Write an enzyme that holds these catalytic residues in place. Structure first.
Site, PDB file in Angstrom:
ATOM      1  N   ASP A   1      16.740 -42.846 -34.597  1.00 16.52           N
ATOM      2  CA  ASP A   1      16.525 -41.405 -34.774  1.00 16.52           C
ATOM      3  C   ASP A   1      16.301 -40.667 -33.456  1.00 16.52           C
ATOM      4  O   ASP A   1      15.438 -39.787 -33.390  1.00 16.52           O
ATOM      5  CB  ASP A   1      15.336 -41.104 -35.697  1.00 16.52           C
ATOM      6  CG  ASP A   1      15.488 -39.738 -36.342  1.00 16.52           C
ATOM      7  OD1 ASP A   1      16.559 -39.095 -36.244  1.00 16.52           O
ATOM      8  OD2 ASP A   1      14.516 -39.289 -36.970  1.00 16.52           O
TER       9      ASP A   1
ATOM     10  N   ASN B   1      12.077 -35.680 -31.358  1.00 22.67           N
ATOM     11  CA  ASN B   1      11.280 -36.897 -31.484  1.00 22.67           C
ATOM     12  C   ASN B   1      10.782 -37.431 -30.147  1.00 22.67           C
ATOM     13  O   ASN B   1      10.185 -38.512 -30.125  1.00 22.67           O
ATOM     14  CB  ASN B   1      12.082 -38.037 -32.154  1.00 22.67           C
ATOM     15  CG  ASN B   1      12.165 -37.827 -33.654  1.00 22.67           C
ATOM     16  OD1 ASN B   1      11.500 -36.956 -34.219  1.00 22.67           O
ATOM     17  ND2 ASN B   1      12.979 -38.627 -34.328  1.00 22.67           N
TER      18      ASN B   1
ATOM     19  N   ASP C   1       8.049 -41.013 -33.966  1.00 21.72           N
ATOM     20  CA  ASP C   1       8.708 -41.007 -35.256  1.00 21.72           C
ATOM     21  C   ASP C   1       9.521 -42.276 -35.485  1.00 21.72           C
ATOM     22  O   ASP C   1      10.729 -42.302 -35.210  1.00 21.72           O
ATOM     23  CB  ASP C   1       9.646 -39.790 -35.417  1.00 21.72           C
ATOM     24  CG  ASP C   1      10.111 -39.674 -36.859  1.00 21.72           C
ATOM     25  OD1 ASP C   1       9.700 -40.534 -37.672  1.00 21.72           O
ATOM     26  OD2 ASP C   1      10.865 -38.759 -37.232  1.00 21.72           O
TER      27      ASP C   1
ATOM     28  N   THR D   1      19.792 -38.123 -37.969  1.00 18.32           N
ATOM     29  CA  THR D   1      19.896 -36.657 -37.885  1.00 18.32           C
ATOM     30  C   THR D   1      21.361 -36.349 -37.605  1.00 18.32           C
ATOM     31  O   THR D   1      21.919 -37.018 -36.743  1.00 18.32           O
ATOM     32  CB  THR D   1      18.957 -36.121 -36.802  1.00 18.32           C
ATOM     33  OG1 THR D   1      17.627 -36.529 -37.176  1.00 18.32           O
ATOM     34  CG2 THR D   1      18.964 -34.598 -36.704  1.00 18.32           C
TER      35      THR D   1
HETATM   36  N1  LIG Z   1       1.586 -38.483 -30.853  1.00 17.10           N
HETATM   37  C1  LIG Z   1       1.849 -37.137 -31.050  1.00 17.10           C
HETATM   38  N2  LIG Z   1       1.346 -36.234 -30.208  1.00 17.10           N
HETATM   39  C2  LIG Z   1       1.594 -34.943 -30.329  1.00 17.10           C
HETATM   40  N3  LIG Z   1       2.398 -34.468 -31.255  1.00 17.10           N
HETATM   41  C3  LIG Z   1       2.922 -35.292 -32.161  1.00 17.10           C
HETATM   42  C4  LIG Z   1       2.704 -36.677 -32.065  1.00 17.10           C
HETATM   43  N4  LIG Z   1       3.540 -37.267 -32.959  1.00 17.10           N
HETATM   44  C5  LIG Z   1       4.165 -36.349 -33.639  1.00 17.10           C
HETATM   45  N5  LIG Z   1       3.794 -35.113 -33.210  1.00 17.10           N
HETATM   46  C6  LIG Z   1       4.399 -33.833 -33.562  1.00 17.10           C
HETATM   47  O1  LIG Z   1       4.709 -33.715 -34.947  1.00 17.10           O
HETATM   48  C7  LIG Z   1       6.144 -33.629 -35.137  1.00 17.10           C
HETATM   49  C8  LIG Z   1       6.512 -34.509 -36.344  1.00 17.10           C
HETATM   50  O2  LIG Z   1       6.128 -35.839 -35.978  1.00 17.10           O
HETATM   51  P1  LIG Z   1       7.161 -36.837 -36.734  1.00 17.10           P
HETATM   52  O3  LIG Z   1       6.602 -38.198 -36.530  1.00 17.10           O
HETATM   53  O4  LIG Z   1       8.616 -36.714 -36.121  1.00 17.10           O
HETATM   54  O5  LIG Z   1       7.077 -36.466 -38.280  1.00 17.10           O
HETATM   55  P2  LIG Z   1       8.387 -36.510 -39.157  1.00 17.10           P
HETATM   56  O6  LIG Z   1       8.895 -38.019 -39.394  1.00 17.10           O
HETATM   57  O7  LIG Z   1       7.983 -35.923 -40.619  1.00 17.10           O
HETATM   58  O8  LIG Z   1       9.481 -35.655 -38.643  1.00 17.10           O
HETATM   59  C9  LIG Z   1       6.754 -34.187 -33.840  1.00 17.10           C
HETATM   60  O9  LIG Z   1       8.059 -33.657 -33.580  1.00 17.10           O
HETATM   61  C10 LIG Z   1       5.732 -33.652 -32.790  1.00 17.10           C
HETATM   62  O10 LIG Z   1       5.926 -32.245 -32.591  1.00 17.10           O
HETATM   63 SR   LIG Z   2      10.748 -39.295 -39.718  1.00 24.55          SR
HETATM   64 SR   LIG Z   3      10.859 -36.307 -36.761  1.00 24.70          SR
END
Ligand SMILES: Nc1ncnc2c1ncn2[C@@H]1O[C@H](COP(=O)(O)OP(=O)(O)O)[C@@H](O)[C@H]1O
Ligand SMILES: [Sr+2]
Ligand SMILES: [Sr+2]
Lengths: 20, 336
Positions: free
Chosen positions: B152, B157, B170, B187
């Protein structure tokens, strides 16, 4: 330009994953 | 360099075989602000009461996971993330669950999504793009060596840390697999052709995706785009790419070998493996050890005004976390 075409497109913001 | 991948695999295998569980609970944390929202919930800035540390907490609604038939992928996500350890991968500090939700508590990466800097500035210069590209190259080398596929890669991400280095986040579609796999997931702009063609695919998808990323970083827009996914898939499959006039010949040549529709000839997928990429001319000036050590000085350092600072993230609408009085989907998530 390609840049203008992209910026006018609907996919310039955060793109969601697809699960299918 | 293969000898340290050895030590690495051993720690990973121990953790993969016996994953940690239930290492915290919701009331050790004060919830501050939503950093992002997603398919199954959201990510929040939280602060750990006893230590005062800030973390990012991913919250998954069990019920929503089940509806979207993503149980297995969710289990993968947590099992893999708690086992890995690498300078450019986000660190999972704690995980636990309650009656309604699953929680993953990671290190807080305060510089924001690569995506938001990318869109704002427009595009990265080739030296700036290459710096980020090298980190991903080492990260995929580490992941693939553990038989993991990431599946991904995209600017949304990738987070930028306080040092200007990348943290990959992610792991929703990460999977440990020897051999091929078949799930349509990822994506749209970043999907390799073999995925769209339902062929059965492998680790080579991640190298394609690196191709797409480097193009997007350096051009400012993706090599294949349209208003609807289906139109994007058409383009990806045709495999015709055009490069901006500003692209160096070396960059164009690297991209032509990553964005290769025929798996037979795609870089990262040949006899020399990742060494074809590390030794390409575009990386001629790259010191891989320096990067690995984070001794290289980032070209870009996000503004940071004390911890708990969220200025590098968009604002989102906040929702209180609701926890049912009854246990939901207990059997399905036993191992989490
Ligand atoms: N360790 C982290 N620190 C800061 N922001 C985070 C972190 N992990 C995720 N986020 C924020 O949250 C968003 C969604 O996290 P994500 O894991 O990609 O959830 P999803 O699988 O639902 O898309 C990320 O794009 C980032 O903006
Ligand atoms: Sr995801
Ligand atoms: Sr994501």
């Amino acid at each position: 330009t390609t840049y203008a075409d992209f910026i006018a497109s609907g996919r310039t913001g955060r793109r969601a994953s697809i699960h299918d | 360099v293969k000898e340290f991948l050895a030590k690495a695999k051993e720690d990973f295998l121990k953790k993969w075989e016996t994953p940690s569980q239930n290492t915290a609970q919701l009331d050790q944390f004060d919830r501050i602000k939503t950093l992002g929202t997603g398919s199954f919930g959201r990510v929040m800035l939280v602060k750990h009461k006893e230590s005062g540390n800030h973390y990012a907490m991913k919250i998954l609604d069990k019920q929503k996971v089940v509806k979207l038939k993503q149980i297995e992928h969710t289990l993968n996500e947590k099992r893999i993330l708690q086992a890995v350890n690498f300078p450019f991968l986000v660190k999972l500090e704690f995980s636990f669950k309650d009656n309604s939700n699953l929680y993953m508590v990671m290190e807080y990466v305060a510089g924001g999504e690569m995506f938001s800097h990318l869109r704002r500035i427009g595009r990265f210069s080739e030296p700036h793009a290459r710096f980020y590209a090298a980190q991903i190259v080492l990260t995929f080398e580490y992941l693939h060596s553990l038989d993991l596929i990431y599946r991904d890669l995209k600017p949304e991400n990738l987070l930028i840390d306080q040092q200007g280095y990348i943290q990959v986040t992610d792991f929703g579609f990460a999977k440990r697999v020897k051999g091929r796999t078949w799930t349509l997931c990822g994506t749209p702009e970043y999907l390799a052709p073999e995925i769209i063609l339902s062929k059965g695919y492998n680790k080579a998808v991640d190298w394609w995706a690196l191709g797409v990323l480097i193009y997007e970083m350096a051009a400012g827009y993706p090599p294949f785009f349209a208003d609807q996914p289906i139109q994007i898939y058409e383009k990806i499959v045709s495999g015709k790419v055009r490069f901006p006039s500003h692209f160096s010949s070396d960059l164009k040549d690297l991209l032509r070998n990553l964005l290769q529709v025929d798996l037979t000839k795609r870089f990262g997928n040949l006899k020399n493996g990742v060494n074809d990429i590390k030794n390409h001319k575009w990386f001629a000036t790259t010191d891989w050890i320096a990067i690995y050590q984070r001794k290289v000085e980032a070209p870009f350092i996000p503004k940071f005004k004390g911890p708990g600072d969220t200025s590098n993230f968009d604002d989102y609408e906040e929702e209180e976390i609701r926890v049912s009085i009854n246990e939901k989907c207990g059997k399905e998530f036993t191992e989490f």
